[PDB]
């Protein structure tokens, strides 16, 4: 006998192995598909979640009732010190998949990157890549090496690069810089590898991977939340107040006979810290860091064209629970996964993007700095003194 009236159901039945993710950095499960027509470029990159604030813009979309009017849309701030290549890595095509073929490293690998090979840097003689480099300046290691760069040049078809972050430049406690494979999509593998080598030990900035007003996809790990109940985890109906042993439950587990209990049904357990891949997050501006010149330091990030004050995206008292943002940044409309301080893999889209809500070019008119630690009313410290006069300290 049957269900008297119908509903729909509680939760998504693809996402269901609701376990605490095996990895702490978002894995890219799938990069795009290349076409030898277009020139070389990296695909992915690395940032850190540092904040959230307002904007204000004057909108064009002909048709709707918000045309040439001024909305406010919200944003996140992702901080992006430019990344440093240290190697290449070749993959081959097969009938059991994609076997990894040969790996090489640069002569000079930093100590934030010699920090990525250890569980303990305190006791260890830091001996990784000590015998390896050696090869890069003897006349019997220019040939063996370029035997092999001439072996990828034949056999391999997929080519990738490898880049360590820069945690000498972030305001965090830690010092262990993230190694991350990245696909290089473009010309025939000959060209693809003429470009790579040439970049070992160089810096690659965010101007080069991404551009303004783009549609990127955002990969990471969730804000975690503890072994939580069935009412918080799955979003069921509470029970009515008279129930003998509790009312934040499912009251019927299963029927009598197919006498098991099915993975379909909702249960207690761990809430959050899953892995997750949201899409189609826009880019409203790519920021510039604190460049010094001619004595003075220049720090106008937030300076829009429509108010030209001296301020950077940084708010009064700093961003909360994080730091100050000096290094060049990207400004995402909408919210993104993870806590503050947590590391956020980027990516292009797979899907070739033409609608109208894609091709919408953006320029802004306001960017928020009023302290988030409280309930702010002042845009910049100097403006305060001017409103308030001198205090009993002066």
């Amino acid at each position: 006998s049957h269900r008297k009236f119908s509903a729909p159901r509680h939760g998504s039945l693809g996402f269901l192995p609701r376990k605490r993710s095996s990895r702490h950095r978002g894995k890219v499960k799938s990069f795009p598909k290349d076409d030898p027509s277009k020139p070389v470029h990296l695909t992915a990159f690395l940032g850190y979640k540092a904040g959230m604030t307002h904007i204000v813009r004057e909108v064009d979309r002909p048709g709707s009732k918000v045309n040439k009017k001024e909305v406010v849309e919200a944003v996140t701030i992702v901080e992006t010190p430019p990344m440093v290549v240290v190697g290449i890595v070749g993959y081959v095509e097969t009938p059991r998949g994609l076997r990894t073929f040969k790996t090489v490293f640069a002569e000079h690998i930093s100590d934030e990157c010699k920090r990525r090979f250890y569980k303990n840097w305190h006791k260890s003689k830091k001996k990784a890549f000590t015998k390896y480099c050696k090869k890069w300046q003897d006349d019997a290691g220019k040939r063996q090496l370029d035997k092999d760069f001439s072996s990828m040049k034949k056999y391999c078809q997929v080519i990738r690069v490898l880049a360590h972050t820069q945690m000498r430049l972030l305001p965090l406690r830690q010092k262990k810089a993230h190694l991350m494979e990245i696909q290089v999509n473009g010309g025939t593998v000959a060209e693809k590898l003429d470009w790579a080598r040439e970049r070992l030990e160089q810096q690659v900035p965010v101007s080069q991977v991404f551009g303004q007003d783009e549609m990127i996809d955002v990969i990471g790990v969730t804000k975690g939340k503890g072994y939580k109940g069935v009412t918080s985890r799955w979003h069921t109906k509470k029970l009515p107040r008279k129930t003998h042993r509790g009312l934040r439950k499912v009251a019927c587990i299963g029927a009598w006979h197919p006498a098991r209990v099915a993975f379909s049904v909702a249960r207690a357990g761990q809430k959050g810290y899953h892995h997750r891949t949201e899409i189609n997050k826009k880019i409203y501006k790519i920021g510039q860091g604190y460049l010094i010149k001619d004595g003075k330091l220049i720090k106008n990030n937030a300076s829009t064209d429509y108010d030209l004050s001296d301020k950077s995206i940084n708010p009064l008292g700093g961003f909360v629970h994080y730091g100050e943002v000096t290094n060049d940044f990207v400004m995402l409309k909408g919210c993104v996964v993870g806590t503050k301080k947590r590391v956020l893999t980027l990516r292009k889209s797979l899907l070739v993007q033409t609608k109208r809500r894609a091709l919408e070019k953006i320029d802004l008119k306001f960017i928020d700095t009023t302290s988030k630690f409280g309930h702010g009313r002042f845009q910049t410290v100097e403006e305060k003194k001017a409103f308030m006069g001198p205090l009993k300290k002066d």
């Binding site: 509903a7 709707s64 009732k65 918000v66 009017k69 001024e70 406010v72």
Partner: protein, 129 residues
Amino acid sequence: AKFRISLGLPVGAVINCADNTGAKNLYIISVKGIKGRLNRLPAAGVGDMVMATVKKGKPELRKKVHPAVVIRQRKSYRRKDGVFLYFEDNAGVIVNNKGEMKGSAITGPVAKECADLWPRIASNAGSIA
């Protein structure tokens, strides 16, 4: 076309009236346009078009269902522009099925989402929002 709102007038509320019919109370029996879900109480807000019983007025009108419209609200609703906006009361008029008023004028303001939407109230209006 109509943007959405943050809504608070579900079934069996009593909003007061803002026309000169001989109607104080309006009582919402259901909302027009709504489809469903198990256990959800169907609700209207500003600009929506309710179905309504009058509860104390000119005996003429009491006992029967007329279509009403909502005009001011007590729930807070965010316009695109940035602001949260809210009123003193819950205020609405008695309408025939096609969208035209029953009273001559309105005792108060109107909300401009509900002075935008309708083609037959904004010219009765006291002061739009």
